[PDB]
Subunit: 588 residues, 2 copies
């Protein structure tokens, strides 16, 4: 239903009056039916008439707008065309666009902003959100006389929850009450980011329409997006009626230029909150929004700084010991779980796992790792940022439906199906209990949903992929040396030849003890020397052919002995190009 | 100096009146000398008298406070002791604490004032960047309130303030750009500015009327004015404002993420009183300036962090993609590697090798820095540093590398470890600063203009955590190196004719299993390479094998020594195969046998 315009209804809340003027001539092109009564001229002659003639404004004047449409705040207005029509003092404001303008007027009515000030310095300097959230609810319920004031905090999915609420001693609270995202469509949520503070004076009013529905010259309906005399959606009107309420004032809590929440208000008797008190509620909205976003900042900072202290202790201790013992890992578990605030963690290293804290069993961890690195969930890896994470496992991996009491959520590094070394942090099932609006009262329990993964705790995880490469390097570093030592404790005398790209000749890469001794010259002086160190012309030709063509050769040939003829077994080593790049040489 | 007490001066600015009441009855325990004149009754009988006697407060009343001390805003007050005491409208406010209270009163004055302020507060809430709004305040506030000079004093890291915005008269000279010492506003004062947001000196060099009972007659404690706006400021500051000429101040506090980001300092060279409605309009503009900038600081921060990660991850991917580090691979990495840290130069190292991109010192100079960093005397530096090592001025940290400053005056060196082989060095070249000072109980005026050489653009913490977030590219570089060398050698040992296999030693609950096995070894058993990897060494030999012979084999496995024994193999078909097991203990850093090489020939 979010498909409704609302910004272009063609109807005005009766309480005030609207007049759309052409900026060329200054003549009223469009006017609401409530205008003809206020001003001294019926709809017929009121239309096409120059605005100056019909209404007078002393404080400020409308003007020519280039591109940025400015607005003129609520100022004194008088009706010279009528002989005594001052049912109340009339105050008018302007919406000055480049194509056309819009003037809106409403009564003045009724120790105001100076009386608000204590409450704004009250919140300003104070801790946590709830404390400020209630300081509003309570402080606002006292300043503007409302029967129910509440703070409607939005979440990730756009489902609102009433965190703070100040009602009458009688009545029942909607505190704790969760509501659908659908109760406030995206369409509307936009308007309460433009047109900050909204007011429905009387629910079930008579909507007085803008008589020339479309612009007589432009052929376009009037955009009330910025107009505060806006006729709200009938979908919501019947909804407020079915909730009882006859009046509503909804302030927007815009934190770091985004809709964090609303200060929704309920008056069960009809009530008009004049432009003055309407701007007082905006002061308390922005003031709350203020140190909410500054409190969000303090928390953020404090956490970032202690998360790095942990992170770097891990980095150091990890790079320190060259031998990942079972004891090493248990000195790392209190801290590895903390840098991400997980309840469990499982360190993998090829068919091996090291479980710490509250993590599923050895076999279950393998079932998750198998299912993650899966071909159908290869799109998941593609889309994820630096690592993969779930808030509810039951959705992402339907096969792993269960496993939720231990791993309902997790973070997984590497994003790549690199295998060998991997890491998995896990937050177990955290059963929620959503007190609905009624999808009167209902109480759905959410199973399988773990504590939502913090982005602070998510970039700190990506800021650890260096411990996966640290793990992986240290593995190859040990295996290479194991094999180097191996080939060095051989009797067959072997050496590795790196192919020269015709820019250089075929030099030596690796050489074992048994090879360096048969020449006489030790290991250090043979590394980096050409294989071309008398011999038969036909025989060396066979040797160089395999070096040329990049093939194999076995030829008995004389050495440089202090003649030592030794058989040369040359084996081309596999290459990613297939093109021979290295050659193993054994001699027995 | 920062050790001066203030907050309990025992003196009041003459312009107003103070009265400390005991909350048990309502009796004035302490009173300022300026009270006896305005209240009527002299100091003698005014003391110990129920406040109810001079009470003429209609608007609101004081009350019993539990723990959180609330305040009552400026409301109408009168004096019933005298038939026409002043000819000026008097207004009083309250500071209600749980132990005692405090009532302060001052004139109402003239020049609706808040409704007229609203446009300007709307205009900043919309304004971009910190600066554009900082001037909207300075200019908008200078017009609203008649101050001869309004300025926005932004604190820098050290607590040295800089006047970023300033709205003065057409005459007089600007302090715009003027940097000041942190010492000019001690930490003890900076605290009070965070409690009392709006502050004013009506006349510099006033007669300070003291609170006659200096200490509480019951408590025995001096009055903590703090929250009291009639507070007598420090004489250290009074002589300072006098030496700057000024006769009146009005200093608002810009408190951003409940921390002192700045002040809206004001100067009136003629004496000036700022009323109750006035004082609070400047607070509204200070709650907005603090607000809009704290949220603008957030937007910027977020936008930068998110585009810093886009770069970071492009590097990560492209780096892990190609398995051989070509010079062109490094040529497309340079625009982005320099960006993720916003350095002017970068030098990628890989064992006596360097790849310089942008504005980095010469190949030889980079080696002189790398040598000096990994130095034994500067091993303490690596110990203390966070994830990586960084300098803002090289000339201090490495005095030997005094020069090199026009290219590498600052840098981020990583790995922190003297791991060598692979390393990375980002560098910001010399950025000659020009700090326009106030002067160096001062005589101020003179803008001294110190020039700072060898100091590069200060290293951003956003650019510092995005630097630690690249440490994985040194380990990526390093793994890929060993990954290639190991595999080169694995392929080597695999294309062997002797028939060799590596045995990983077992323990108390683990037997001796096989780590690596070649094709010449896997064929003599028959069973291919893949089945034998992980196979226990005790499987390999037959179950008919000589008791004395296997004992010799297991002895070398036990004691961790060498053995050479001809023994029968586990023959799949049933063909007797007896090869001479050459078992060589492989060198270990402990010396304790960890692995074994098993050659076979007999
Ligand atoms: C089409 C879907 C809708 C459902 C379902 C529903 O309940 N409302 C729907 C649409 C509209 N809601 C609009 C505005 C709106 N809705 C709320 C919701 C609540 N307010 C409350 O006080 C409580 C509980 C105490 C709830 C659940 C509010 C506060 C508002 C803004 C109110 C205002 O205008 O003052 C809306 C927009 C209409 C418009 O403004 O033109 C639509 C279409
Ligand atoms: C003991 C150290 C001090 C030196 C030296 C000095 O010059 N002042 C010292 C002490 C105090 N300063 C206090 C307040 C204060 N200082 C400043 C700084 C400036 N004011 C300016 O106009 C300029 C440049 C034009 C600068 C750099 C300000 C703005 C303030 C606050 C003014 C006020 O609102 O009163 C101070 C605290 C006194 C108090 O309020 O009790 C001390 C001790």
């Amino acid at each position: 239903c979010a498909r409704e315009p609302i910004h272009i209804p063609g109807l005005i809340q009766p309480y005030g009056v609207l007049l759309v003027i052409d900026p060329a001539d200054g003549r009223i092109v469009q006017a609401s039916t409530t205008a003809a009564d206020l001003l001294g001229v019926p709809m017929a002659a009121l239309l096409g008439m120059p605005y100056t003639q019909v209404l007078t404004l002393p404080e400020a004047q409308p003007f020519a707008v280039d591109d940025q449409p400015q607005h003129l705040m609520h100022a004194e207005v008088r009706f010279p065309q009528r002989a005594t029509p001052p049912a109340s003092a009339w105050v008018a404001a302007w919406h000055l666009y480049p194509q056309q303008w819009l003037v809106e007027m409403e009564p003045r009515d009724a120790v105001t902003l100076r009386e608000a000030m204590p409450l704004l310095r009250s919140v300003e300097r104070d801790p946590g959100i709830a404390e400020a959230a209630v300081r509003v609810a309570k402080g606002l319920r006292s300043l503007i006389g409302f029967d129910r004031v509440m703070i409607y905090r939005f979440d990730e999915e756009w489902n609102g929850d009433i965190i703070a609420e100040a009602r009458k001693p009688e009545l029942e609270a909607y505190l704790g009450q969760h509501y659908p995202a659908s109760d406030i469509p995206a369409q509307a949520r936009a308007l309460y980011l433009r047109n900050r503070v909204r007011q429905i004076a009387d629910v079930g009013y008579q909507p007085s329409p803008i008589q020339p529905t479309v612009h007589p010259q432009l052929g376009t309906p009037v955009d009330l997006s910025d107009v505060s005399l806006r006729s709200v959606s009938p979908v919501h009107l019947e909804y407020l009626a079915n909730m009882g309420v006859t009046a509503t004032l909804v302030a927007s809590i815009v934190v770091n230029d985004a809709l964090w929440g609303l200060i929704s208000c309920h008056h069960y008797s009809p009530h008009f909150t004049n432009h003055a008190m309407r701007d007082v509620t905006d002061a308390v909205a922005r003031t709350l929004a203020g140190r909410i976003g500054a409190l969000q900042a303090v928390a953020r900072a404090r956490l970032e700084s202690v998360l790095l202290t942990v992170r770097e202790k891990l980095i150091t201790d990890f790079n320190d010991a060259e031998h990942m013992t079972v004891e090493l890992l248990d000195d790392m578990a209190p801290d590895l779980m903390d840098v991400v605030d997980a309840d469990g963690v499982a360190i993998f290293h090829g068919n091996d796992i090291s479980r710490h804290g509250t993590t599923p069993d050895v076999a279950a961890l393998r079932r998750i790792r198998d299912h993650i690195e899966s071909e159908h969930h290869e799109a998941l890896r593609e889309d994820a940022v630096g690592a993969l994470h779930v808030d509810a496992i039951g959705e992402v991996f339907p096969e792993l439906a269960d496993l939720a009491p231990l791993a309902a959520g997790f973070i997984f590094v590497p994003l790549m199906p690199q295998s060998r070394s991997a890491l998995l942090w896990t937050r177990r099932e955290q059963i929620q209990q959503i007190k609905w609006a009624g999808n009167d009262l209902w109480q759905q329990t959410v199973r399988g949903r773990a504590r939502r993964w913090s982005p602070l705790h998510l970039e700190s995880a990506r800021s650890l992929r260096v411990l996966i490469e640290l793990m992986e390097r240290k593995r190859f570093q040990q295996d290479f040396t194991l094999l180097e030592a191996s080939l060095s404790r051989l009797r067959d005398g072997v050496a590795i030849i790196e192919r020269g790209t015709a820019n250089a000749a075929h030099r030596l890469l690796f050489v074992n003890t048994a090879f360096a001794d048969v020449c006489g010259s030790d290991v250090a002086e043979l590394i980096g020397r050409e294989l071309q160190t008398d011999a038969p012309r036909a025989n060396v030709e066979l040797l160089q052919d395999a070096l040329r063509n990049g093939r194999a050769a076995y030829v008995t040939l004389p050495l440089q002995v202090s003649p030592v003829y030794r058989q040369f077994h040359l084996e081309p080593l596999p290459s990613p190009s297939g093109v021979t790049a290295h050659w193993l040489l054994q001699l027995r």
